Structure formats: C-alpha cells, structure tokens
Amino acid sequence: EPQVQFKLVLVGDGGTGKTTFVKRHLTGESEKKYVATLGVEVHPLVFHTNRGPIKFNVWDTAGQEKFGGLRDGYYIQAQCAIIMFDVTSRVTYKNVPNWHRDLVRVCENIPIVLCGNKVDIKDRKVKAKSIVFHRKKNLQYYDISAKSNYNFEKPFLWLARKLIGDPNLEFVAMPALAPPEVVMDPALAAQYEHDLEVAQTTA
C-alpha cells in the first residue's frame, strides 16, 4: 500500500524562525533527512486525519536565504508551501511578496499559507491590520509562535484540505510536539485572535 505525502517548501527571510518551526515536530525532527547537494534538511511530518495518515515533507533551508534567492532544485515539485515572516521585523513582511513571486514562478498555482511567527513576544511591530498580502489570491494566514507551539497545526490542516479537497478533513490527534520553551499568554492570544477577525470583516 502506497502512502499519502506532499512536498512542502518552507520559505521566508532568514531569522524568521523557519527552522525553529519545522523542528517542533519530534518525529519529523528525528527522521529528517539531508540533501547535501542542495543544502536542505527534509522533515517528514505525519499528521493523523480522520481520513488517515498524511505526510508533509517539509524542506528546510541550511540558511542560504540570507545571501540571496533559492535554486529551482529547491522549489521543484513543491505541492504546497508556507511563507513565513517575523512579526517583530517589518522588513521580513515587506519581503513576503518577493518570496511569493520566486515561488509561483516555479510552482504555478499551489496552495500557500502565510505565517506570522514570534507572536509570543510582547512588543509586536506588524499588527493584524498591517497584514494584507493574503487578502489577494489563495493565501490563508495564521499568527504562529514556534516556541510555544501556538497554532502549529493550523497551516497544515488548511493545506491538507486543499490538497485532498476535503473541507471536512480533521486531525484526530495533535502530533507529538517539543515542550513550549516560552509561554503564550492567553491574553495576547485572545487580543491577537480578535484583532484578526475585526480585520477580515472590515477593509
């Protein structure tokens, strides 16, 4: 019997926390592999859906993004993607369109999720009102916090529903995750979740 797996490329400015993020998933981290001809650790992240097991094969960079754009060999056969920026860092958000372009160019029309990492930090710079890129297109957006696991599963659930074409797909159990190294205040999470809704119904 053949398995269900997708190549998921993880792009965004260096320092946004991509590596921190893919690593929250213990089994993915320990079974991850290493394409040395491309400088890339692939991380098999299995999620258990009410329909069965699904594997996102997340391609994480060995840092080459701080010094320019990535090679086609990286984007090849991508079947979905996550774009990440740092909410403490406006420039990372300003380079989001840049990544999106370099992506679409190689991956004509694949599902993409935009992610605001580091929401755990109090002094945030890129509030919900500023987040607008996803308004256009086929770009679902979630606040996330790698270090507290906050919304870790969201990006993946949303990507699974598109690649399966099942709006009613559910994860039966949350995968095994590294213990949250920082806390995610329920206040911030509540204000930030609320600041996301009171934006989608507005402009």
Binding site: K7, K33, V35, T37, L38, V42, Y74, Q77
Partner: peptide
Amino acid sequence: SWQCDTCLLQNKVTDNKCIACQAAKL
C-alpha cells in the same frame, strides 16, 4: 511512482534519478 530515499520526493518510472536534487535511483 517510486520515492527517493534522500529527500522523499515522488519521482516517475521514466525518471532514473531525482528531478529535484539529481540523486540516483537505487
């Protein structure tokens, strides 16, 4: 379709190596 045991990409039978990292099929 077989799978490359280096990067996990799903290549084709007509492919004899990997269309992503140029790695040989075993």
